[PDB]
Amino acid sequence: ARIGEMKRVTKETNVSVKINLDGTGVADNSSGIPFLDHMLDQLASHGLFDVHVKATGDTHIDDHHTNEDVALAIGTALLQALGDRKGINRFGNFSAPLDEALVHVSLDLSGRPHLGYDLNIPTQRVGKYDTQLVEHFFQSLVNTSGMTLHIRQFSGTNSHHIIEATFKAFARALRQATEYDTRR
Amino acid sequence: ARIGEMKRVTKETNVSVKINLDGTGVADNSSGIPFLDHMLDQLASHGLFDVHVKATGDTHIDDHHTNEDVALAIGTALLQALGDRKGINRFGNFSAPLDEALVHVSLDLSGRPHLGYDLNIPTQRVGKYDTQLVEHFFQSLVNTSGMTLHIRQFSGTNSHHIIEATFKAFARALRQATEYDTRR
Amino acid sequence: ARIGEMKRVTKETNVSVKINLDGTGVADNSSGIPFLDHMLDQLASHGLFDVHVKATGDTHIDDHHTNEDVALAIGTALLQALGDRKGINRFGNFSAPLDEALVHVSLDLSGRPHLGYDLNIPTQRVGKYDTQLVEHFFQSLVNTSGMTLHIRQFSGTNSHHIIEATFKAFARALRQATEYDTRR
Amino acid sequence: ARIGEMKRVTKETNVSVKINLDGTGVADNSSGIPFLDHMLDQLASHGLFDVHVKATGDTHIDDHHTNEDVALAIGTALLQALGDRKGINRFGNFSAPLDEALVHVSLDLSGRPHLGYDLNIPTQRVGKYDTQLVEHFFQSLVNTSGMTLHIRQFSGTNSHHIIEATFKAFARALRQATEYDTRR
Amino acid sequence: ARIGEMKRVTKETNVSVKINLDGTGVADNSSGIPFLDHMLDQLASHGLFDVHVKATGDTHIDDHHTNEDVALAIGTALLQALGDRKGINRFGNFSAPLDEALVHVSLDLSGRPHLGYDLNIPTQRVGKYDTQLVEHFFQSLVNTSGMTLHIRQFSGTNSHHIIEATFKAFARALRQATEYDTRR
Amino acid sequence: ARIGEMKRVTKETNVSVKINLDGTGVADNSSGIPFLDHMLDQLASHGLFDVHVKATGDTHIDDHHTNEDVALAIGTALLQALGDRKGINRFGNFSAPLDEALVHVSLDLSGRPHLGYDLNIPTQRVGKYDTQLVEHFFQSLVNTSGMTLHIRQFSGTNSHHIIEATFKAFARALRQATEYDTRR
Ligand SMILES: O=P(O)(O)OC[C@H](O)[C@@H](O)c1cnc[nH]1
Ligand SMILES: O=P(O)(O)OC[C@H](O)[C@@H](O)c1cnc[nH]1
Ligand SMILES: O=P(O)(O)OC[C@H](O)[C@@H](O)c1cnc[nH]1
Ligand SMILES: O=P(O)(O)OC[C@H](O)[C@@H](O)c1cnc[nH]1
Ligand SMILES: O=P(O)(O)OC[C@H](O)[C@@H](O)c1cnc[nH]1
Ligand SMILES: O=P(O)(O)OC[C@H](O)[C@@H](O)c1cnc[nH]1
Ligand SMILES: [Mn+2]
Ligand SMILES: [Mn+2]
Ligand SMILES: [Mn+2]
Ligand SMILES: [Mn+2]
Ligand SMILES: [Mn+2]
Ligand SMILES: [Mn+2]
Ligand SMILES: [Mn+2]
Ligand SMILES: [Mn+2]
Ligand SMILES: [Mn+2]
Ligand SMILES: [Mn+2]
Ligand SMILES: [Mn+2]
Ligand SMILES: [Mn+2]
């Protein structure tokens, strides 16, 4: 089983993260940000990873520094879990709906970081969560993990539906790229 | 008296609902969402139904899952109260103002679900309540009850006035369609 | 083997339907509408289902009531064949060409009905079949089965080619979503 | 193992080609055109075919006649390797990135030739290779093999990145369509 | 060492301020406004001033009166610390980035107050802090200190990044203008 | 003296690089690309670094793979030379002309990679060198070194003048950011 780990402490935040790439979908996510915990459960449920996050930070300023440090920690742990990368599929591709929304995702585990982001989120807040932090989460994840990632919206109107469909399609495309390629 | 009931429990919410179609306007509505309780009182007061709702949920994420599960429960209870549908008017139609706002409603108790929605709500929050949830409430209600519904705005500026006039006109059109047609 | 059945008789039509989700591609389709029989054979041939339809109706008015009642019967039989839905893939996705035409399909077996339809069919009749009935067929199927469905055109000019490519891509995406997920 | 062969000699060129559809990714490509050799290596590496090309021609006029005759020879050898086409998947579909570029490919091994081409290459030369020859290569390949092919660009800026991503996505979609379908 | 002081009490607020122009970067900032404390720490860290603020006010109306009175107090203390202004550089100029944002600042310690402000902040709230108060802060500071100030945005998208880059560039330009000019 | 080193060998290229941050302007640059050697001499001459590059590659395809691998090696060696980064200026800023051209540069040695690129180069080739490789050079350098970089054109017409003025302004801004800050 490919298991990666990371711990990071600064003057703003304290973060611990653990990821299993050959899991059964166990989730235990307790950051300081309740809506982000709901999205990280989708990564376990539709990708079948084991995911565990614990974090405390400076949320009386805002949620920005806690959102950034958690995303950096997940990228580092994924790069440690993958290792040599011998014998994997390496590419993944999927489109996923939630009622009237639909999002398309493709990625490549290349060693070269890049983000292409093309979403149109029509409100500024979902509950207490700020909607500019969705794009900042994915940009910090690709910088520490070294992946090429493209995200593109086909339709949708409700803001809760659009974000949750992104995290569903991302989970299924990442599951495809990390599985072993039994050859032709 | 035509009385319908429903109870639904999931990992997000716990909901109980009871509706009387031949009532005197008794209201007892205690969801977790205070502005939605104020709108459900209009359904009892202007339609003369008896309406009772009790709900608890996961409102520290947001109000979305609690708003959706309550609406599904009301649609199921209405379909159980109606039964065979022998001898009713079946169609209803009404327009209702509140100061400078005016909304037109027509519906048909057909067995075929459809929503046509045409409102223009100019702010994002009324009190703590999110304004995209008005359209999600009516879409969940027509899917479990099987009704054809059309809603169209003629004028209006204040957001509180526009939503409360929708729930007034809906109540008077539903009262017309469920009453017995003493024949010509 | 997951097998679903339905019989419906009204003052307009008489319909019998049977579907096997673990089939070998046996087709026996005899509605009153010859072009619709040719499309239902594609569902058996490219999805590997067993499909059987028998229908008579009031085709001297037009084909509308017979087209609607057959589609409702197929949705009910699919919902009975699926049952609990334990252990399936649940999502499906595919794009299919026929000469110069190309159509993209994605779906989710959710319990929440919705149709997104985006085709541009350039003539009014193919043989004797009316081209507005393509959209009415898919809307009746999602209302009884409870599925989320999105259909989108990428290119194409000939009307026979565009409709037949829709039914090919739909068959391959439905085969993906009903198969058992041997886990990671 | 399905192996196809072809030899063609005219007053312009001399060409020999050999392809294995059940290979391990062995490449030995020596045409007179160095950039085209680099693209043919991608077909072996990402599709897992065995590919061997040897060619000499009249490259002091230009590269046009050598580029056309090699493409015709590959189409003939693929049609000989496939034979009866009993029991294959027959359809294939994939999207592939390279940094900021992304291209979508779908195809069908039908017996009816057609090309849909939609790329936007922003310079006239990559090294010594002329960029109008990319479209001429794919048009000659579909005429001798008899396949339906669609190619469409989603993003990209660098000319080397756009062409190499086309040959990657084409390789993965062709691998899907030639594999045996173990039935449902 | 050039040290300036100020105390101001009204029926709205109570404010105490102390600034050292020849400091080592010691910060002790406790206003009633948490996001403004985070920006005042940047003034100590990148300009190497010693800065100390203590304030209480009427924040149950809003943050406006507390934001205005703190800014007036800082301008007065800077004018007392500078004194005669013999032998200083008097002018300062700097451009500073933070990820995708970039802001240009130039100023002159002239005795004539003026503000030129050209920022485009795309949301209304960062955490609890209102974004119209950024411009009101700088206008009150130049009126009591008597400085000419110009602020201009070159790029940027995230609201937290744009404001924090303004306070970084302002700190480095003010450090340049208050240092002693060892002559040519 | 802060000295960094790197050696990288792949199936495309062979590269060796050495950089001194406290140098006297000694240059010894022998890649396979003659115009790129002329630009690397500007980095020694105007920034006062010592720079040494040796490379061989696959330039009969094109110059792309050799241009990319050299840029990656320089970024790694700079990150090794900097180390802890205690006591440096960390920011740099400069604008530089060459006849009718003028380019503005600012950067920050942050640990977070980002490139903003805004040039308009009016021809496709300068000598034998391809002009799309200027942007690819700077993107590979910021990914291995972890710097924030912004480049913006103010005027210019001749292609040789525009590129050489970029490399002059970059050299003077990097010299500023790596020097020791004798404190205030
Ligand atoms: O079981 P699902 O994966 O379909 O989860 C849907 C839930 O009800 C909830 O996550 C949701 C419903 N609408 C937005 N979010
Ligand atoms: O008695 P009414 O039905 O007219 O209720 C009006 C109330 O004052 C209140 O519901 C309201 C007034 N304006 C918006 N809402
Ligand atoms: O064998 P296929 O699946 O390619 O069927 C094609 C048939 O010839 C026919 O269905 C058709 C050809 N053009 C439109 N329809
Ligand atoms: O190993 P890869 O498949 O990612 O090959 C990338 C190579 O470095 C090279 O083919 C390339 C890099 N950029 C354009 N071409
Ligand atoms: O050390 P820095 O000056 O780069 O501070 C950056 C911090 O992480 C934080 O202030 C920040 C990061 N993004 C916005 N704010
Ligand atoms: O001495 P300089 O730095 O001005 O170098 C100018 C040279 O003549 C040469 O590099 C040049 C002149 N025009 C373009 N390049
Ligand atoms: Mn940030
Ligand atoms: Mn949800
Ligand atoms: Mn919902
Ligand atoms: Mn009211
Ligand atoms: Mn109808
Ligand atoms: Mn046909
Ligand atoms: Mn030709
Ligand atoms: Mn290449
Ligand atoms: Mn004021
Ligand atoms: Mn910050
Ligand atoms: Mn490259
Ligand atoms: Mn020169």
Residue numbers in the entry:
A (entry chain L), B (entry chain E), C (entry chain O), D (entry chain A), E (entry chain K), F (entry chain W): 78 to 261
What text does the study give?
The crystal structures cover the MtHISN5 sequence starting from Gly77 or Ala78 through Arg260/261 (chain and structure-dependent). Both cryoEM structures (unliganded and IG2 complex) have been reconstructed from EM maps with octahedral symmetry, and therefore contain 24 identical protein chains, spanning from Ala78 to Arg261 (IG2 complex) and Arg262 (unliganded). The cryoEM MtHISN5-IG2 complex structure reveals detailed information about the most likely substrate positioning before catalysis. The imidazole ring is trapped between manganese ions, facing its Nδ towards Mn2 and Nϵ towards Mn1. While the formation of the active site with the bi-Mn2+ cluster requires a contribution of residues from two subunits, a third subunit participates in substrate/product binding by contributing guanidines of Arg167** and Arg189** that bind the phosphate group. However, based on our complex with IG2, these polar H-bonds are rather weak, with the donor-acceptor distances of 3.5 – 3.8 Å. It must be emphasized that our MtHISN5-IG2 complex structure is a spectacular example where the cryoEM maps are of such a high quality that they permit resolving stereoisomers of ligands bound to a protein. In fact, we expected the reaction product, IAP as the enzyme was incubated with cIGP (at 2 mM concentration) for 2 days prior to the cryoEM grid preparation. Interestingly, with 2 mM cIGP, the initial lag reached the maximum time that the PEAQ-ITC apparatus offers (170 min). This peculiar behavior can likely be attributed to the contamination of cIGP with IG2, as revealed by our cryoEM experiments.
Plant HISN5 catalyzes the sixth step of the HBP, in which imidazole-glycerol phosphate (IGP) is dehydrated to form imidazole-acetol phosphate (IAP). The MtHISN5 subunit contains a four α-helix bundle sandwiched between two β-sheets whose four strands are almost perpendicular to each other. The dimensions of the MtHISN5 oligomer did not change significantly after the binding of IG2, indicating a lack of major conformational rearrangements. The active site of MtHISN5 (see below) contains two Mn2+ cations (Mn1 and Mn2) bound by residues belonging to different subunits.
